Amino acid sequence: TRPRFLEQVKHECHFFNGTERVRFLDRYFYHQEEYVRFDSDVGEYRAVTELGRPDAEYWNSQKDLLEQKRAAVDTYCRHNYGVGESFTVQRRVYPEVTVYPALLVCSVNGFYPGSIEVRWFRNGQEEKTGVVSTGLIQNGDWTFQTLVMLETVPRSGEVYTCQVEHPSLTSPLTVEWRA
Amino acid sequence: EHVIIQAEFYLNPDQSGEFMFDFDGDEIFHVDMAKKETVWRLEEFGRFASFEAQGALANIAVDKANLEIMTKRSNYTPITNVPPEVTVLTNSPVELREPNVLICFIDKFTPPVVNVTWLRNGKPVTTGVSETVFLPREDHLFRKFHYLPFLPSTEDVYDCRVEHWGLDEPLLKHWEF
Amino acid sequence: ARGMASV
Amino acid sequence: SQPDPKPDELHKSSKFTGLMENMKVLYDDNHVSAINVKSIDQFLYFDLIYSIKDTKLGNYDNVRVEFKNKDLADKYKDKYVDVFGANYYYQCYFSKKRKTCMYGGVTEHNGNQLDKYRSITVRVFEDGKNLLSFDVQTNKKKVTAQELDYLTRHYLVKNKKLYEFNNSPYETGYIKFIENENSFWYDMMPAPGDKFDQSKYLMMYNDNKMVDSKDVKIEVYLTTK
């Protein structure tokens, strides 16, 4: 029952087009409320709320740490990006695609990164209507999954194809299911 | 495109903290403050990079210091409990006798404290379980994953039991084949 | 990797 | 209780390429010691902070003591204890509401005192031969292995150059504690590499292991290079 008090700190590096445009943010929070932050595009600490006022003024008076934060985009952001690039930015895990009835379901699992494209085809033609997706689901272990269902109006001998496009592949991945 | 976040937090009166690196929503690693070592989310990450775990403690000590100060400035205003929404799903499509993983996803909640228990046919399961630490969200609440490897069977039923001060009573998310 | 210091 | 070191399982000083001085200073003259004191705060749930002042050279006012787990910490949080251990400064971090850090070394004060100092004999073997034997003293019925390890090593640094500024005259070395045909030991040499992490080496004391001063015997095994 004892009331809780939480302090959170988030040092973020945002990358646009590789490392050409980098934005650094030094954020502080009391519970879930951000009270002070340093922004690369500003060059100083600004109080987000009155509780941060004393900090923004005191920290900005210290020319030693402002120098440090103003160089963060290079010494911290770009440096770390280079160190982790091979296993984060360039991580490629191909997906596993499964097609099963009961309405047709196309399950795409264990892929990374999240950018993917799943399409349903009926006799060589792409299906637009009767297609529902669950969206991108994170498993928490650096893999994603997604299910794309197709409302099916049965027929004799027609073939259904689930086509998947993903960065880890050379060409689209396919799975054909015939009744 | 991409975001790399070094996330930290200290909690009173539990006197516990966390220090982790996040890449586009996934944990690269977190620091075990008692063993003073770097715990990579995936083993292989350790073969490509390194991190001086002890450095994390310096940041955590400073975090507690700021907390002490903010606790007073705010006139001892405590945190407001936000109950988590729980989802239970599987790692891949289910097929009898084929290894799979049950995922209990706990989302949108604070403070970062939860009791998660897996139940098979109403009874506690602790063997083979693993979990992630608290992951940060953009709204500054938290996420957390708990796993249970299992062999799909028609005679077993599972429940993910979550306890959180934002809930009047334990929440139970059920799953069955 | 380099750490950024909390202040 | 513990199987004696198998050759090759022991760290070898020749495989250490950093400054042995970093090891030497942990077992030199300075160390933490305080009688009948009580913790005044905690940083993390598995530690206790004490306000012990470095009389000699005045380097610290507070000391962080870390334990293997939360249980150990809760057990002594509100008790008056005697503190004794090897301390470090590099990578020592915490905050209350300079400083030094250490692991374990805590014994409950009351009923643990002796009117006179007791002698624990140490027998030193160099290449299997017992050329030196001396005694270390304690006035505690129950002492941490840490205190005895520190006293024993400090004597060896002064008299056998156990650790020198660059390296050591010995290749391997381990200290063995025998208490009623029950025993355990510690590797006295740095792990292989070019860097020595004092904080990680001292962590082996965080279990706060204790022995009976009346029963313990100490044997030190050293091999020459």
mmCIF file of C-alpha atoms in Angstrom, chain B:
data_model
loop_
_atom_site.group_PDB
_atom_site.id
_atom_site.type_symbol
_atom_site.label_atom_id
_atom_site.label_comp_id
_atom_site.label_asym_id
_atom_site.label_seq_id
_atom_site.Cartn_x
_atom_site.Cartn_y
_atom_site.Cartn_z
ATOM 1 C CA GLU B 1 13.886 5.366 -39.258
ATOM 2 C CA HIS B 2 15.763 4.491 -36.094
ATOM 3 C CA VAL B 3 16.009 5.325 -32.416
ATOM 4 C CA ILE B 4 18.464 4.146 -29.776
ATOM 5 C CA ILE B 5 17.445 4.808 -26.183
ATOM 6 C CA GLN B 6 19.441 4.421 -22.982
ATOM 7 C CA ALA B 7 16.586 4.088 -20.478
ATOM 8 C CA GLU B 8 16.907 4.265 -16.695
ATOM 9 C CA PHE B 9 14.640 4.439 -13.652
ATOM 10 C CA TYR B 10 14.893 4.261 -9.866
ATOM 11 C CA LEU B 11 11.978 3.366 -7.618
ATOM 12 C CA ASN B 12 11.276 4.260 -3.987
ATOM 13 C CA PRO B 13 10.756 2.769 -1.504
ATOM 14 C CA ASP B 14 11.638 -0.499 -3.246
ATOM 15 C CA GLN B 15 15.158 0.832 -3.801
ATOM 16 C CA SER B 16 15.559 -0.884 -7.141
ATOM 17 C CA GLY B 17 16.535 0.435 -10.521
ATOM 18 C CA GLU B 18 17.037 -0.586 -14.099
ATOM 19 C CA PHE B 19 19.450 0.451 -16.832
ATOM 20 C CA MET B 20 18.924 -0.654 -20.419
ATOM 21 C CA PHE B 21 19.477 0.120 -24.091
ATOM 22 C CA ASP B 22 16.559 0.002 -26.521
ATOM 23 C CA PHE B 23 16.676 -0.100 -30.340
ATOM 24 C CA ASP B 24 13.395 0.550 -32.159
ATOM 25 C CA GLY B 25 11.430 -0.989 -29.294
ATOM 26 C CA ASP B 26 13.664 -3.979 -28.639
ATOM 27 C CA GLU B 27 15.996 -4.424 -25.700
ATOM 28 C CA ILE B 28 19.640 -4.669 -26.717
ATOM 29 C CA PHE B 29 20.688 -5.368 -23.123
ATOM 30 C CA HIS B 30 20.207 -4.355 -19.506
ATOM 31 C CA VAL B 31 22.595 -4.272 -16.552
ATOM 32 C CA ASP B 32 22.354 -6.671 -13.642
ATOM 33 C CA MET B 33 23.295 -4.356 -10.784
ATOM 34 C CA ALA B 34 24.062 -7.096 -8.269
ATOM 35 C CA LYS B 35 26.402 -9.136 -10.495
ATOM 36 C CA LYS B 36 27.586 -5.951 -12.148
ATOM 37 C CA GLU B 37 27.524 -7.412 -15.634
ATOM 38 C CA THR B 38 25.941 -6.789 -19.032
ATOM 39 C CA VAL B 39 23.025 -9.080 -19.932
ATOM 40 C CA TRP B 40 22.446 -9.163 -23.697
ATOM 41 C CA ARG B 41 18.927 -9.868 -24.939
ATOM 42 C CA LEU B 42 20.366 -12.317 -27.454
ATOM 43 C CA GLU B 43 23.670 -14.069 -26.741
ATOM 44 C CA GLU B 44 25.246 -13.295 -30.093
ATOM 45 C CA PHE B 45 25.035 -9.554 -29.413
ATOM 46 C CA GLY B 46 27.819 -10.087 -26.916
ATOM 47 C CA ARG B 47 30.237 -11.233 -29.618
ATOM 48 C CA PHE B 48 29.979 -7.954 -31.545
ATOM 49 C CA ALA B 49 29.997 -5.303 -28.857
ATOM 50 C CA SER B 50 30.923 -4.593 -25.272
ATOM 51 C CA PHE B 51 29.674 -2.425 -22.448
ATOM 52 C CA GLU B 52 31.207 -1.475 -19.097
ATOM 53 C CA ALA B 53 28.352 -2.491 -16.808
ATOM 54 C CA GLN B 54 29.758 -0.783 -13.720
ATOM 55 C CA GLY B 55 29.247 2.584 -15.379
ATOM 56 C CA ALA B 56 25.505 2.081 -15.046
ATOM 57 C CA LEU B 57 25.655 2.305 -11.248
ATOM 58 C CA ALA B 58 26.989 5.852 -11.430
ATOM 59 C CA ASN B 59 23.903 6.891 -13.387
ATOM 60 C CA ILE B 60 21.520 5.023 -11.076
ATOM 61 C CA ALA B 61 22.999 6.704 -7.959
ATOM 62 C CA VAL B 62 22.450 10.094 -9.581
ATOM 63 C CA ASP B 63 18.919 9.038 -10.534
ATOM 64 C CA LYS B 64 18.065 8.247 -6.903
ATOM 65 C CA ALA B 65 19.484 11.630 -5.888
ATOM 66 C CA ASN B 66 17.234 13.454 -8.383
ATOM 67 C CA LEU B 67 14.278 11.358 -7.191
ATOM 68 C CA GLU B 68 14.867 12.432 -3.598
ATOM 69 C CA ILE B 69 14.854 16.047 -4.750
ATOM 70 C CA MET B 70 11.790 15.751 -6.997
ATOM 71 C CA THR B 71 9.907 13.892 -4.269
ATOM 72 C CA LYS B 72 10.251 16.975 -2.066
ATOM 73 C CA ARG B 73 9.676 19.651 -4.732
ATOM 74 C CA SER B 74 6.394 17.990 -5.711
ATOM 75 C CA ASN B 75 5.378 17.968 -2.046
ATOM 76 C CA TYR B 76 5.569 14.174 -1.835
ATOM 77 C CA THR B 77 3.059 13.527 -4.633
ATOM 78 C CA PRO B 78 3.092 9.755 -5.288
ATOM 79 C CA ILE B 79 2.651 7.920 -8.592
ATOM 80 C CA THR B 80 -0.816 7.124 -9.980
ATOM 81 C CA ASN B 81 -1.363 3.412 -10.666
ATOM 82 C CA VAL B 82 -2.204 2.459 -14.235
ATOM 83 C CA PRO B 83 -3.362 -1.176 -14.638
ATOM 84 C CA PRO B 84 -1.834 -3.246 -17.486
ATOM 85 C CA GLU B 85 -3.771 -4.821 -20.311
ATOM 86 C CA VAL B 86 -2.718 -8.433 -20.773
ATOM 87 C CA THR B 87 -2.647 -10.469 -23.965
ATOM 88 C CA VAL B 88 -1.751 -14.147 -24.313
ATOM 89 C CA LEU B 89 -0.660 -15.433 -27.710
ATOM 90 C CA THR B 90 1.596 -18.021 -29.270
ATOM 91 C CA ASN B 91 4.980 -17.735 -30.955
ATOM 92 C CA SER B 92 3.811 -19.614 -34.063
ATOM 93 C CA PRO B 93 0.715 -21.411 -35.405
ATOM 94 C CA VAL B 94 -0.393 -24.163 -33.046
ATOM 95 C CA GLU B 95 -0.117 -27.852 -33.968
ATOM 96 C CA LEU B 96 -0.512 -30.798 -31.599
ATOM 97 C CA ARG B 97 2.764 -32.137 -30.231
ATOM 98 C CA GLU B 98 4.799 -29.431 -31.979
ATOM 99 C CA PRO B 99 6.938 -27.222 -29.690
ATOM 100 C CA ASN B 100 5.644 -23.691 -29.315
ATOM 101 C CA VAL B 101 5.854 -20.750 -26.941
ATOM 102 C CA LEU B 102 3.079 -19.029 -25.006
ATOM 103 C CA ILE B 103 3.690 -15.317 -24.672
ATOM 104 C CA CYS B 104 2.071 -13.305 -21.914
ATOM 105 C CA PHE B 105 2.290 -9.653 -22.958
ATOM 106 C CA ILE B 106 1.762 -7.121 -20.124
ATOM 107 C CA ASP B 107 1.307 -3.580 -21.515
ATOM 108 C CA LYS B 108 0.662 0.096 -20.557
ATOM 109 C CA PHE B 109 1.334 0.133 -16.823
ATOM 110 C CA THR B 110 3.153 1.821 -13.901
ATOM 111 C CA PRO B 111 4.822 1.607 -11.495
ATOM 112 C CA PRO B 112 7.287 -0.992 -12.886
ATOM 113 C CA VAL B 113 6.301 -3.778 -10.467
ATOM 114 C CA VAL B 114 4.298 -6.880 -11.369
ATOM 115 C CA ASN B 115 3.785 -10.462 -10.251
ATOM 116 C CA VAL B 116 3.347 -12.787 -13.195
ATOM 117 C CA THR B 117 2.493 -16.461 -12.759
ATOM 118 C CA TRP B 118 1.819 -19.134 -15.356
ATOM 119 C CA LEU B 119 -0.773 -21.787 -14.610
ATOM 120 C CA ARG B 120 -1.295 -25.141 -16.315
ATOM 121 C CA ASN B 121 -4.662 -26.707 -15.470
ATOM 122 C CA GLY B 122 -4.943 -24.362 -12.504
ATOM 123 C CA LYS B 123 -1.497 -25.109 -11.098
ATOM 124 C CA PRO B 124 1.743 -23.004 -11.054
ATOM 125 C CA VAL B 125 4.391 -23.614 -13.704
ATOM 126 C CA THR B 126 7.930 -22.376 -13.100
ATOM 127 C CA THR B 127 10.104 -24.702 -15.149
ATOM 128 C CA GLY B 128 11.265 -23.327 -18.473
ATOM 129 C CA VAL B 129 9.898 -19.850 -17.902
ATOM 130 C CA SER B 130 11.775 -16.708 -18.847
ATOM 131 C CA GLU B 131 10.892 -13.038 -18.911
ATOM 132 C CA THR B 132 12.122 -9.657 -20.076
ATOM 133 C CA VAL B 133 12.797 -6.728 -17.756
ATOM 134 C CA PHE B 134 10.599 -3.637 -17.896
ATOM 135 C CA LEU B 135 10.645 -2.081 -21.367
ATOM 136 C CA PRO B 136 9.986 1.640 -21.866
ATOM 137 C CA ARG B 137 7.086 2.970 -23.969
ATOM 138 C CA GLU B 138 6.784 6.350 -25.678
ATOM 139 C CA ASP B 139 4.056 7.404 -23.234
ATOM 140 C CA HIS B 140 6.511 6.517 -20.518
ATOM 141 C CA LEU B 141 4.559 3.606 -19.073
ATOM 142 C CA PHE B 142 6.017 0.100 -19.434
ATOM 143 C CA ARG B 143 5.842 -3.217 -21.343
ATOM 144 C CA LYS B 144 6.970 -6.694 -20.278
ATOM 145 C CA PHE B 145 7.072 -10.176 -21.801
ATOM 146 C CA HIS B 146 6.843 -13.561 -20.050
ATOM 147 C CA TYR B 147 7.415 -16.851 -21.869
ATOM 148 C CA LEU B 148 6.381 -20.461 -21.383
ATOM 149 C CA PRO B 149 7.648 -23.163 -23.743
ATOM 150 C CA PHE B 150 5.016 -25.839 -24.199
ATOM 151 C CA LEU B 151 3.821 -28.737 -26.292
ATOM 152 C CA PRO B 152 0.290 -28.096 -27.607
ATOM 153 C CA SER B 153 -2.212 -30.621 -26.222
ATOM 154 C CA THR B 154 -6.006 -30.893 -26.210
ATOM 155 C CA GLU B 155 -6.069 -31.718 -22.501
ATOM 156 C CA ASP B 156 -4.157 -28.720 -21.148
ATOM 157 C CA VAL B 157 -5.365 -25.211 -20.430
ATOM 158 C CA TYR B 158 -3.228 -22.210 -19.525
ATOM 159 C CA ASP B 159 -3.704 -18.928 -17.727
ATOM 160 C CA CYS B 160 -1.361 -15.995 -17.269
ATOM 161 C CA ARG B 161 -1.976 -14.490 -13.846
ATOM 162 C CA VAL B 162 -0.999 -10.843 -13.387
ATOM 163 C CA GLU B 163 -0.925 -8.914 -10.120
ATOM 164 C CA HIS B 164 -0.623 -5.123 -10.068
ATOM 165 C CA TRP B 165 -1.616 -2.400 -7.589
ATOM 166 C CA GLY B 166 -3.585 -0.776 -10.396
ATOM 167 C CA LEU B 167 -5.948 -3.758 -10.262
ATOM 168 C CA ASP B 168 -8.466 -4.448 -7.486
ATOM 169 C CA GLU B 169 -7.840 -8.160 -7.936
ATOM 170 C CA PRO B 170 -5.517 -10.479 -9.948
ATOM 171 C CA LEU B 171 -6.116 -10.557 -13.687
ATOM 172 C CA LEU B 172 -6.297 -13.901 -15.502
ATOM 173 C CA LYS B 173 -5.722 -14.311 -19.224
ATOM 174 C CA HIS B 174 -6.723 -17.734 -20.457
ATOM 175 C CA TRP B 175 -5.511 -19.813 -23.382
ATOM 176 C CA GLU B 176 -6.428 -23.268 -24.613
ATOM 177 C CA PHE B 177 -6.146 -25.253 -27.831
#
